Subunit: 71 residues, 2 copies
């Protein structure tokens, strides 16, 4: 699945216009990126956490629920 297909599937499921899903997804991605650039952690209950680690690289730690859904 690419970003376009993600936007399309979400727009269908949520009953939202594609342009609005694109805006909101893009804003989510920008917000997460900006927070990582500032060295912050982004923890999303039920999904996982994004954080920068040591040079510095972004890392994703899947949460318990997600780890169980795929294993």
């Amino acid at each position: 699945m690419n970003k376009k297909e993600l936007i399309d599937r979400v727009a269908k499921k949520a009953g939202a216009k594609k342009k609005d899903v694109k805006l909101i997804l893009d804003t989510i991605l920008e917000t997460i990126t900006e927070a990582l650039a500032k060295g912050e952690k982004i923890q999303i209950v039920g999904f996982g956490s994004f954080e920068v680690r040591k040079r510095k690289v972004p890392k994703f730690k899947p949460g318990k629920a997600l780890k169980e859904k795929v294993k």
Copy 2:
């Protein structure tokens, strides 16, 4: 940053109602989770890719742009 703060910051930046950001974010997360559970890859240009690897665990590979934004 937690999920609530993420929703709030995105809602402000996008000029969207919090309830709509919550719906769309939650639907994005569900869609990514469901795709991972089916063994699919979710590749988002300019951010990164989500995929399941070998037992099985979810993994995130940051893209070039993100790797550069934080390093």
